[PDB]
Amino acid sequence: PHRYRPGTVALREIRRYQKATELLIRKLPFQRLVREIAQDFKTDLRFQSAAIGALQEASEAYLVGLFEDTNLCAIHAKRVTIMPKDIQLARRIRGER
Amino acid sequence: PHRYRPGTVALREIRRYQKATELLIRKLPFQRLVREIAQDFKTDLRFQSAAIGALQEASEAYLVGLFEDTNLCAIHAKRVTIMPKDIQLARRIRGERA
Amino acid sequence: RGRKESYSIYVYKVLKQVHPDTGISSKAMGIMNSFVNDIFERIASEASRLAHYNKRSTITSREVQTAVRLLLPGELAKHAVSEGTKAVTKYTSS
Amino acid sequence: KESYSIYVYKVLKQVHPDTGISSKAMGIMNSFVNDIFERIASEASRLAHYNKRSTITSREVQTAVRLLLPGELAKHAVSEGTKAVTKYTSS
Amino acid sequence: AKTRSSRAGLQFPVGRVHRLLRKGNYSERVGAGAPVYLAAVLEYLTAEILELAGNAARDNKKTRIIPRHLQLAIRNDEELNKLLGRVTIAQGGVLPNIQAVLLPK
Amino acid sequence: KTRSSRAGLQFPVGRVHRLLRKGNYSERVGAGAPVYLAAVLEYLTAEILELAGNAARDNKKTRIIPRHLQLAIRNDEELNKLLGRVTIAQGGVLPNIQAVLLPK
Amino acid sequence: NIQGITKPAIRRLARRGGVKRISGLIYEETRGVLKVFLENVIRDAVTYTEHAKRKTVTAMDVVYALKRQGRTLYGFGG
Amino acid sequence: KVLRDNIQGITKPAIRRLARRGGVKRISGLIYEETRGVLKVFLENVIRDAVTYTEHAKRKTVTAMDVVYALKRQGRTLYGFGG
DNA sequence: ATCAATATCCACCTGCAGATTCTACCAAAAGTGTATTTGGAAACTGCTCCATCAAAAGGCATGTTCAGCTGAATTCAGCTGAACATGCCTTTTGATGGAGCAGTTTCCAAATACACTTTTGGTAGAATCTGCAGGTGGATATTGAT
DNA sequence: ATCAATATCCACCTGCAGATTCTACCAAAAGTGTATTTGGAAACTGCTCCATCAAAAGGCATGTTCAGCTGAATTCAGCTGAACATGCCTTTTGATGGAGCAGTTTCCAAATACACTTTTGGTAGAATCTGCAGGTGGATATTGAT
């Protein structure tokens, strides 16, 4: 059989998704999440299609940048694996907490 | 003679300077630095006393907050000594230089 | 000459309301004045933006209202909106 | 409903007369123009108020560009701006 | 002649806030309830800070609020800290806080 | 005989003037201000379209898409400073793998 | 519903972010952060909808809402 | 009189005190240079904007409001000098 | 598990610098009478937005195997903290010249306000066209194994 | 190193359809001409408030020594998270078709601007109380050596 070493396909994925600009979250689960959250502030709300797409553009962008800062915290602690403490440090430095 | 172990007076000082609100940079040296940085921007301009005091309040404030973040970066790398590597990470995440 | 206003007369009034025994140093009064001016600006300009997004030439107590909702964290917002509506109804009873 | 669409297309034909522009990318240019407009206009407003002036002049727009644009982008901006104002009042 | 502040039951100047809304170029015209509502929100927030700051003044055994007590009130209250997160209180100091990792084992 | 042509610009100086009067920025708007501003907006737009057009050429394409714009903003230093807190929808990120993460 | 953001997608997000290796605890922490994000943004966007006496969140509501949070987004209206 | 090499007046003990109020226990030796680096970039940025206000007001004296407006612009809002 | 060695509480005292109060002004808020415009209040479309409905193709969940990364446990050169001895320079204090901020006027040049005249930018259908997307065929990068 | 056998990447050409670009006529600006209104440049000028100085003194900065203990560098194994082949289902289209509902007018009543003419509440600067800052020495912890 044939098999790639752990780490290789990871870098292949990084090279691919940094090359692309497509959204990476499946659209419908996201839409369900958005209207589920909005229900908690105003009831029976409709959404412009453009607004679900804007909310997803914006949030996926947010998460990718948070992963950059996270990755740097992982590196800084002599690691290669991102952990919850890396996300928690990144947000604490950004001001979000 | 007596001798406090490395770290005891360090913590004595953290406790002391956190209880205070006095400025920690000397007034005249800061004023000279400020007038130089301004001079190398516009020529023979005056400074209201309050504006140097505003610059110093804001600057010590800024740097103390940067040290808090720096320290958490050091702890996060399982250290207790703050290093330049830590400051450069803290600023990078803050957006100040990236 | 020339005379310059501030909120010190009112900050002092509210200080003797909540803690009638305590007083306030001028440096702290400046900090308070700074706070009232900051929050004034934040509210008025977020409200300005509200009225502009909705093509309305007038800022009403309703614009100020949702500006406060948008800008103040909860509970401070709840209590704020409460005292604001209180004062506006009481006002319009001539 | 207005937009900055035809003006971005015009300036595109100046720098790159060969190339064209996607619709989503035109929306992005639109957002960029509105944004920069807002930043500059409101900074100029504050300039006016801070000095108790009642009118926003090119002097204010200029100091706004100095404050907002990371010169060298600012140096070229101030140039392009005074240039266009000089040519305007000539004629 | 009654001041609008008393008509609305406030200590803050409703006339002055109304004047500051026209001279500030926020809107072409200003409704009559806006300065009342706003003067009420500002007076409320001033009260809410002064409360916690006076408390912090009493704790330190002092009868006069200094900038420190204001910083203590802002930084220990979660919501005022959120509201003044990017604001620096001159002569205010920091909250006592030593990271646990650093303490004598 | 318009104002934009009088200033030698392609951006609408009249419309910029109307948006400034109607934007609630100041009581009066000087006559040269909308000219100056429209000139600054045209210039910045040119600078971006230039750099993004080069990204379009370099990618073997004729039509500028959002990707070319994001490449133009982030690969240039000063426009990155100016739009550092802006998110370009459909823009992607710049290819960047930390050296620490590379084979051997 | 929040568990509907599958791990293969959070994987992809970290990939675009430049992440090589990912702890298993990440995905729950990520869903948490994402929820706080939509929570904050939508709360504001809906405050704009209610102020405009509407029943439909428009894309401009999301844009104005994102601007308030310093997450300025281009390509949807401003 | 000529002004030179003035960042060196930001003494090593004063950078220590600032790090203490920050909650730092141990400080590597290179920090003192790194800190001055950061401090200069901070002051430059602020003073640059502060002076752009002074110039726009056609004045020769940097006022405290000039600094306060400048810090506001940088998102370093300062209370206690502001009027 | 002790004592010295010092640091850090705290409470007490007391004149002085920084409050608090006591005052005439006067700028601006308030009262009143017209003039303007405001933004709901019903009346009616057209959009976009929900909502089923109904195949196919993906793309997710899930199990199994192990490569190799994260933590832990040691070891140790040496960096950085603690203590000093010295003497520099910041601080404090009070005085003086004068630059230049800021209160007044005075008075054009430049802005606002109408009122028609004239042009342009936006729409919504008509005439192109770049690039996705899919198809081989060839080097490329990767990982096993004498 | 390379030899080999996967699989991955990569051009070169490909043909169509979702979008782009270009045409063709209309309200809302925008430019124009005239008449008023005025914001702030210009010009003295009172006068804070800034730069600078002298002098003396003691608070701290500098530099040096010595060693405790931190950060780095190392070895090692358990175990977590990657790569995959598998198997099933939830996301994705795609119109379809009804309907909530965001957008438009059009009267006009209520609310706001506005122009003046009083009527104070606020502010500047006297005057007058009064915390608490910054000494002082006891009691109380806190350290760190034996």
Author numbering:
A (entry chain A): 38 to 134
B (entry chain E): 38 to 135
C (entry chain D): 31 to 124
D (entry chain H): 34 to 124
E (entry chain C): 14 to 118
F (entry chain G): 15 to 118
G (entry chain B): 25 to 102
H (entry chain F): 20 to 102
What does the paper say about this structure?
Chromatin, composed of genomic DNA and histone octamers, dynamically changes its structure to achieve correct gene regulation, replication, and repair of genomic DNA. The recent advances in understanding chromatin structure have unveiled the diversity of histone proteins, the so-called histone variants, which play specific roles in specialized local chromatin structures. Thirteen of these variants share functional amino acid motifs with H3.3 and are suggested to be subsidiary variants (sub-variants) of H3.3. H3.3 and H3mm7 differ in their amino acid sequences only at T32I and S57A; however, it is not clear how this small difference in the amino acid composition of H3 results in a marked difference in function of the nucleosome.
Here we demonstrate that the histone variant H3mm7 is required for skeletal muscle differentiation. We therefore analyzed the crystal structure of the nucleosome containing H3mm7. The overall structure of the H3mm7 nucleosome is quite similar to that of the H3.3 nucleosome. The crystal structure of the H3mm7 nucleosome revealed that the A57 residue of H3mm7 does not affect the nucleosome structure, but the residue is unable to form a hydrogen bond with H4 because of the absence of a hydrogen donor. The dissociation of nucleosomes was observed for both H3mm7 and H3.3S57A under conditions of 600 mM NaCl, but this dissociation was not observed in nucleosomes with H3.3 and H3.3T32I. This suggests that S57A incorporation results in unstable nucleosomes. We found that the H2A–H2B dimer became dissociated at lower temperatures (60–70 °C) in nucleosomes containing H3mm7 and the H3.3S57A mutant compared with those containing H3.3 and the H3.3T32I mutant. These results indicate that H3mm7 nucleosome stability is less than that of the H3.3 nucleosome and that the H3mm7-specific alanine residue at position 57 is fully responsible for reduced stability of the H3mm7 nucleosome. Therefore, we concluded that H3mm7 is more mobile than H3.3 in cells, probably because of unstable nucleosome formation due to the A57 residue of H3mm7. H3mm7 may enhance the levels of activated gene expression during differentiation by forming a relaxed chromatin structure.
